[PDB]
Amino acid sequence: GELFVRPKLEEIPPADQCRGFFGPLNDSLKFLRLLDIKWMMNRAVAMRREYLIATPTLFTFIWMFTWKGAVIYFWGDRAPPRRMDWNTEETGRLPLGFKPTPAPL
Amino acid sequence: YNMLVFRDPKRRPQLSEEERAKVVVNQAEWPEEFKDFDPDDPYKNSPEIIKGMSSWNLFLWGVECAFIYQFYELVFPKSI
Amino acid sequence: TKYELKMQYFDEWMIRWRKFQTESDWEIEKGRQWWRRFNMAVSGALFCGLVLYTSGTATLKRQYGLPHFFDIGVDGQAKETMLKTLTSRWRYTPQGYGRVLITGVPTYILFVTLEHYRERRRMQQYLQQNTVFGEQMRRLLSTGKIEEYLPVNIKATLPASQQAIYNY
Amino acid sequence: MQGSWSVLKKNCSNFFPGLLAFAQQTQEAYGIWLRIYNRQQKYGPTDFVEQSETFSPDYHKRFHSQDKNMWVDKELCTEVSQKEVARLMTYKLDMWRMAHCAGALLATGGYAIPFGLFWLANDTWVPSSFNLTGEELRAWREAQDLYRYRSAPSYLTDTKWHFDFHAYPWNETQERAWDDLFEKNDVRRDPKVVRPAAEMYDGFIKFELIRRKSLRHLCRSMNIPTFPMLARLCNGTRVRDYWNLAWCEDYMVITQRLHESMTDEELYDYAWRRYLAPYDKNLNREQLMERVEDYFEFLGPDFVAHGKAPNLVILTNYVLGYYNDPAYLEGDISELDKNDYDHLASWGKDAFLRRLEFENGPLRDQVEAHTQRLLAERAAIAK
Amino acid sequence: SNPADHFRPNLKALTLYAERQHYVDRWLHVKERWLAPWYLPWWSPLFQLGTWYSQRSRNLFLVENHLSYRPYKFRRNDEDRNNPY
Amino acid sequence: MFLFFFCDLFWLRLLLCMYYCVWSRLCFIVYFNCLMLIFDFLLFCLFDLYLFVGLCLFLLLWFMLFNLYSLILYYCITYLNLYLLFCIVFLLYIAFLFLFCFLCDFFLFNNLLVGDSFMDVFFIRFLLCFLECFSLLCRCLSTFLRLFCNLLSSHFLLLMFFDFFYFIFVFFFYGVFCYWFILFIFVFCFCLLFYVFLYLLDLFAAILQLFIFCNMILQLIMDFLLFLLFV
Amino acid sequence: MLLGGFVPRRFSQFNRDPCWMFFIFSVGFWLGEYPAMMIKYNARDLVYDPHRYVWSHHDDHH
Amino acid sequence: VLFSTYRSSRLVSKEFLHGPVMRFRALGEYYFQRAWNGTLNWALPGEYRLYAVMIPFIYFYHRWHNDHTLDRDHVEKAMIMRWGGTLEDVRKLSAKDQLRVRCFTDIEKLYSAYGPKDTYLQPPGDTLPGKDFYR
Amino acid sequence: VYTRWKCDRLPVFQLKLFTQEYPMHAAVGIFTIIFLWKHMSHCSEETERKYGWWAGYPYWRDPIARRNETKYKQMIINNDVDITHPKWTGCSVEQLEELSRVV
Amino acid sequence: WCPEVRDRAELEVDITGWQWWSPLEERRLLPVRLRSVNEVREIMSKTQAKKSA
Ligand SMILES: CCCCCCCCCCCCCCCCCC(=O)OC[C@H](COP(=O)([O-])OCC(O)COP(=O)([O-])OC[C@@H](COC(=O)CCCCCCCCCCCCCCCCC)OC(=O)CCCCCCCCCCCCCCCCC)OC(=O)CCCCCCCCCCCCCCCCC
Ligand SMILES: CCCCCCCCCCCCCCCCCC(=O)OC[C@H](COP(=O)([O-])OCC(O)COP(=O)([O-])OC[C@@H](COC(=O)CCCCCCCCCCCCCCCCC)OC(=O)CCCCCCCCCCCCCCCCC)OC(=O)CCCCCCCCCCCCCCCCC
Ligand SMILES: CCCCCCCCCCCCCCCCCC(=O)OC[C@H](COP(=O)([O-])OCC(O)COP(=O)([O-])OC[C@@H](COC(=O)CCCCCCCCCCCCCCCCC)OC(=O)CCCCCCCCCCCCCCCCC)OC(=O)CCCCCCCCCCCCCCCCC
Ligand SMILES: CCCCCCCCCCCCCCCCCC(=O)OC[C@H](COP(=O)([O-])OCC(O)COP(=O)([O-])OC[C@@H](COC(=O)CCCCCCCCCCCCCCCCC)OC(=O)CCCCCCCCCCCCCCCCC)OC(=O)CCCCCCCCCCCCCCCCC
Ligand SMILES: CCCCCCCCCCCCCCCCCC(=O)OC[C@H](COP(=O)([O-])OCC(O)COP(=O)([O-])OC[C@@H](COC(=O)CCCCCCCCCCCCCCCCC)OC(=O)CCCCCCCCCCCCCCCCC)OC(=O)CCCCCCCCCCCCCCCCC
Ligand SMILES: CCCCCCCCCCCCCCCCCC(=O)OC[C@H](COP(=O)([O-])OCC[N+](C)(C)C)OC(=O)CCCCCCCCCCCCCCCCC
Ligand SMILES: CCCCCCCCCCCCCCCCCC(=O)OC[C@H](COP(=O)([O-])OCC[N+](C)(C)C)OC(=O)CCCCCCCCCCCCCCCCC
Fold this sequence. Notes:
Shape of chain E: flat
Bound molecules: cardiolipin, 1,2-diacyl-SN-glycero-3-phosphocholine
Oligomer: part of a larger assembly
Organism (chain D): Trypanosoma brucei brucei (strain 927/4 GUTat10.1)
Number of helices of chain J: 3
Helix content of chain J: 55-70%
Keywords (chain D): Membrane, Transmembrane, Transmembrane helix
Protein name (chain C): Transmembrane protein
Transmembrane segments (chain C): 38-56, 96-114
Keywords (chain C): Membrane, Transmembrane, Transmembrane helix
């Protein structure tokens, strides 16, 4: 809609103010910030870096709408059957008495 | 007037009533095609494209062509 | 030497006659897939390194400067270390076509060379195979033509329940 | 210019001597560029050296900023002379075209040979080194001028139309400047009158916001190869480098008044590299000096005072306006005595055409009066 | 049914049939003929563009190990749901 | 399988060649809004926002040469297939979407995250973003589905009504000479009224559906355009 | 766009322009083909095919 | 150098076939190049007579194609299936018999969904041949 | 003055139009064409019989069988295929002769 | 025989300037007209006063 101006370095709130799924991951819990997805989302919104949430989604949809959708439809592996036709590993080997041609030299 | 969805265009007046009243009409200068000109029937005196060819004659020509189209095979049938 | 032109016919034939694909040939193809992924990874790493090296000083300062998304403390230390390492010495920082060439040509050359020599490796592997696929590869390199229906000509092994067709 | 067999023979004969000359020029130009680059890195401003980032306000795409990413080295005369800078500029053009051709060769292997035959048959994209005599050089310059004529009007029209359709000048002086900027080369534009357009357009589109299509037109007009165009920040970099070198040379010349002592041919080349003086115009020294002085005046006092040139888009439009020839008009006025629709005369007029002629002809007033009177009578009778 | 039949192209002239194997092989022969000459090195972008993607796709097909059965693409009858053969 | 066939426009191509060997002004356009995107002066866009005009004009001409003339009996809409229309809309829509995505400006997608900071990010805003990203593709699908269905339904109805009219006209006109002539005349007048009404409705609907087809594409374009103000 | 052109006031004027002459001919064909179908397909001597129950499109499309 | 990229490279003289071309342009321009012939997106002209001429012509040639190329296939199928299942069997009939059969097919077409259903549904007790007549 | 639409010949203008005016649209169209001819260019014999014929499949002459017969005869004659080979029949030639004498 | 109009129109369309209306340029140029004699006298008087000053 309107033009977007990136926030200044002073306008970005501190990381300690961000909240996770249950509560802020302050000192003694900082390393849990990496694992909490909601905390990362809130931090991105706070820093005005909302694209980190939006860009991966849309692109993914496009990737599904364009390339993977048809790949799954045409070449995907359906559910296996109850009685399974496993490979006996007997096919392919040359028969006894066969004289294979020499390799290049 | 209209003929189905085709409406006859009408020229907008350009003269005011005062100026218009001072105009002297002399139909002797008009072409013979347009004398006693009527906006509701401007082509009443217009010449025919082909002398003696009426609109009903053309309509009947089409009707006869349709009858031929539907009845020729009844008189000269052909095998598959 | 151009191995791809020889190998395309062989790959198409194998797809058409994949029933006779032994587990050894399957392992060969899986190794080819793994090496393709490895080549992609190393080429991407080289491309990223070249991009980082040729990046502008202001660009690096913005990228590896404040603020910190997580602000754990290790993040800031790592960013400062990388920024100091890059900005300490002088770096050739081209723009436009020049950066395109510098970042891309080495990557393309590396990827293409690795893939080509892995294709040669796969050709050698199939040459050394003692299966019908290996025999087809050897015949292809000898006569220059793919001999279809070879597995049923030389009577390649079949499951015990499907040997009736060979009964002649 | 179109390809020809004579030019093909010329370029095939001079192919290897041309390559050798290009290699020698490459060594010399590398030396000159090394001097300039060392001086830029040592004495350049922090923003220029660090390559400060300037992003657009709408899509935040980086592009060169005229104020920050361009720097006029006022003291370059100590290390590099004016002639060396001109040599470097000419070599940059030749090297760009050669680089594109070499890239095509490497990409397509031996399948580029027939395209090379198309290439040597035209002087548009061959280096200047392929010409070993004066006449060959003259023909080559004619080809370059023809390409400039072909490309410049589109650039000028793009700029003018987009601005005029989406914006208008603020005051009368800006209106006059904008109108006089895009006059044909048959009339002389006063740089003092036209300068305010630079600020007016700075309000609209700075060089950092130049669109990719406009950039393509500009590079076509500057004899810069455009295929593959790629991102706009590649040919934009080429344009920035070329005009930065040009401004350094311009400062040197203005400060030292070299153009007055410059000889006729060298002066003509200096104007040509600024896209001010086509060779097909057969200009004399008076006209060349007038155009060069107008260019310096357009740069303005601030250029010497602080090394800041006017908006690059408007500057390019101004200089390329010399290649905006008047629209051609050939044929005697007597040709206007003929008729265009004689082939329809046999068809005559149908009923509707006759009605239109009758109602809208010299008797139109009488017909209108009669029709209105009849309609009024019918309306009165109806009521 | 009859109304539905009115929505078909009315100017069908000729139908040609060709097996995927046959024209794929012919295309491969053309590609080999044009990519064979010495003056087109294997490291050129043109050669890699011609060969690498095809090699990758064929390798992906060969590596495939699916627990389900994919019916033959060019069966005589693919309209019966209860008969993959 | 390779089927060789021809479109049903050859006579119209002949007429186009005959009547457009000389220039003519165009002043009536089905979708005029592609030419006027900006309504407030001093606003300008650095994006190529007028790139859609040529495709819009050609698409209108093509779809009009097919759909409008299909009202004539036995005229064939050669492209009337669901997946073919899907291909057409895919081309246009995905091409413009990829034009915006190749711009490599991620901030352009900031508006996808609906709402303000007050709303919970994971349980409200992110689900709205998911729905909006889904809605873009759904808009593409709905556009092509709407174009296909209108033509199919309109022409099915026309065919069925024409069949009924032929039946009653041919096999029950003798009632004009019978004592129940008034019933037949009433039915015949009703059929004529229905005939005219259906033709007018189809004529209006075809043009309106082309208008909406172009409007969807222009809406896709407009959703990502940003305008600067001249100073 | 239906802006203008010759417009006959009544039937008798259709013969004042070649294009409307062709139009009225076509209208004659259109309207006169229906009476012909009435006469042809409601004829006394028209007989249904004896083998009409041997085959029908209904069994074919089913 | 082999072929010009410019349209200005003429392949013929300016006066080549001038007369026929001028007659063709006269045919094109007389009715179309008029103020009241304002088109809607180049497809719908303003001149009434263009409609009056082109709608009948389009219908006529489309109908001829449909009657002689498209519906003929259905007619021939009905004739073959109802009278032997082979072309030779149909040709064993006379032209008059084929005319009767084809006109019955036309009857079925005109009834379609509103005619009597005894034209294709055999009532119980009917003595006419059934579906297994030729089997 | 120079304009692409007025000065260039039709093939040149076509290339320019789809390379510097609508390159993305051309790319997407080519992508879709490749997809269509890779996944929507096959029709089985049963599908042809069900839907491939205007008035229906003429079983009374079975044109598909004739088409396949011509195809296979042409392939056999041109490629010098021995259709009596054991792989095609599943039995030796002598067994084939024995079967011929039996039946 | 009016080459400037032709060239401008062709160039504008070729650079994607499809629109045929230019309200802003018209607004700039619409009230332009040759002056009356009295207006010329006033303008000459103004110029003479400026030169004298
Ligand atoms: C700029 C564009 C913007 C506009 C976009 C416009 C379009 C819209 C966008 C969306 C797209 C629309 C779709 C259009 C169609 C396009 C074509 C398409 O879709 O084809 C898909 C198509 C899908 O394949 P397919 O044909 O369906 O076949 C399926 C098979 O899987 C194929 O098998 P294969 O043999 O080909 O191999 C494929 C392989 C591809 O991958 C590989 O080959 C290997 C990896 C390659 C890496 C490439 C380099 C990356 C960078 C390297 C490092 C740099 C830094 C170095 C310095 C470090 C210092 C410390 O993938 C796999 O098989 C998966 C392997 C995964 C292994 C995971 C192992 C577990 C550990 C690692 C993960 C978990 C980590 C947890 C960490 C936790 C920490 C707390 O092709 C592929 O995806 C594969 C081929 C192409 C691979 C290209 C690789 C590079 C990709 C770009 C990376 C950089 C850019 C992204 C980041 C940007 C940030 C700013
Ligand atoms: C026959 C050959 C076939 C070739 C195939 C390969 C493709 C084509 C090759 C190249 C063709 C020629 C032209 C290419 C484009 C030219 C662009 C251009 O003009 O750039 C000018 C520009 C110069 O301008 P500059 O002013 O110097 O700098 C740009 C400004 O900063 C600009 O400033 P700004 O303000 O615009 O800043 C923004 C700028 C900032 O970026 C830059 O400009 C920096 C440079 C790019 C950095 C990209 C790396 C980012 C980090 C990646 C991290 C990945 C981690 C993954 C870890 C995985 C672990 C498991 O852009 C971005 O932010 C874009 C970031 C990229 C986003 C990617 C999103 C992809 C989404 C994927 C969707 C899903 C895909 C399918 C599914 C896959 C998975 C299953 O050039 C560059 O910056 C670098 C150009 C590099 C060109 C590409 C080199 C190609 C090498 C090919 C090697 C492989 C060959 C394989 C052959 C196979 C057999 C045939
Ligand atoms: C064998 C494998 C081949 C691989 C396949 C290649 C396929 C073809 C692609 C093109 C390849 C290049 C062709 C040769 C170009 C000539 C050399 C050059 O760079 O000229 C300078 C010139 C620089 O242009 P610029 O705009 O001034 O650059 C701005 C910079 O700021 C400029 O910086 P500055 O302003 O600070 O000034 C510096 C200037 C100052 O210097 C001077 O003033 C002196 C003159 C120096 C340049 C002289 C160039 C002469 C060109 C003509 C050569 C003679 C031709 C003879 C022909 C007839 C032969 C019989 O010096 C430079 O120009 C240096 C530029 C940076 C170096 C670029 C080279 C990097 C690649 C080479 C290393 C590769 C190592 C591999 C390691 C492998 C590891 C695994 O290059 C160009 O004109 C650009 C090329 C134009 C065509 C572009 C075509 C698309 C490219 C897409 C590539 C994407 C990645 C690759 C994959 C593609 C898959 C689709
Ligand atoms: C020994 C030498 C030294 C060593 C080598 C050195 C290196 C040399 C190489 C580098 C040279 C660079 C400079 C080159 C300049 C010249 C370029 C050029 O062509 O100029 C036009 C050149 C004339 O130039 P000019 O007269 O000087 O005018 C120049 C002006 O300045 C006018 O200029 P302009 O700007 O107006 O012209 C530009 C025009 C240039 O174009 C043209 O002018 C078109 C030329 C062709 C016109 C053809 C017309 C005739 C057609 C005939 C058709 C057949 C007729 C029937 C035949 C029956 C035979 C029995 O347009 C373009 O630039 C468009 C570029 C389009 C690029 C396309 C890119 C596609 C990319 C694909 C998408 C990828 C997306 C990414 C996907 C990624 C996926 C992972 O045109 C010609 O001479 C026409 C030649 C026609 C030949 C005959 C027809 C074709 C014969 C084909 C035979 C095939 C045999 C095999 C068949 C096998 C069947 C199985
Ligand atoms: C084996 C049996 C034979 C068949 C073999 C086929 C082989 C196939 C190989 C495999 C291909 C697989 C893929 C197939 C996909 C098909 C998809 C498809 O159809 O999509 C529908 C789609 C429908 O498009 P559309 O909307 O109808 O528009 C296309 C139209 O062509 C109209 O579009 P347009 O109007 O925009 O086109 C431009 C048009 C612009 O307008 C014009 O130029 C007007 C003329 C239009 C002609 C084209 C229309 C054709 C109308 C029907 C045929 C006309 C009568 C033919 C009579 C045949 C009698 C037996 O200009 C032209 O057409 C240029 C050519 C002009 C030729 C003029 C020749 C003059 C000769 C004068 C000689 C004088 C000699 C005097 C001697 C005196 C001695 C004393 O078709 C296409 O888009 C084209 C598909 C073509 C695919 C390539 C096929 C390969 C080439 C085959 C050539 C065979 C030549 C040998 C035949 C010999 C006789 C038996
Ligand atoms: C901008 C709006 C335009 C509106 C135009 C309105 C036109 C009004 C037409 C009035 C009736 C015309 C009757 C024609 C009769 C022809 C002969 C005949 O038998 O036809 C019967 C046919 C069919 O009648 P039917 O269905 O009763 O046929 C019976 C036949 N059997 C029994 C065998 C099935 O009539 C029509 O189909 C006419 C429908 C016309 C609908 C309007 C079409 C408008 C779009 C095309 C415009 C073309 C302009 C081209 C100009 C040049 C372009 C470059
Ligand atoms: C009666 C049944 C009815 C069913 C109806 C179902 C709906 C049918 C709708 C059809 C009409 C609408 C079609 C719209 C378009 C759909 C597009 C689509 O999904 O196609 C996907 C498909 C996917 O291709 P694919 O199917 O070949 O995938 C290969 C994947 N393996 C090998 C694992 C099987 O695209 C194509 O068909 C085109 C492929 C070639 C062009 C692209 C090449 C570049 C690829 C880049 C990435 C990989 C290489 C590395 C990078 C580049 C290096 C140079």
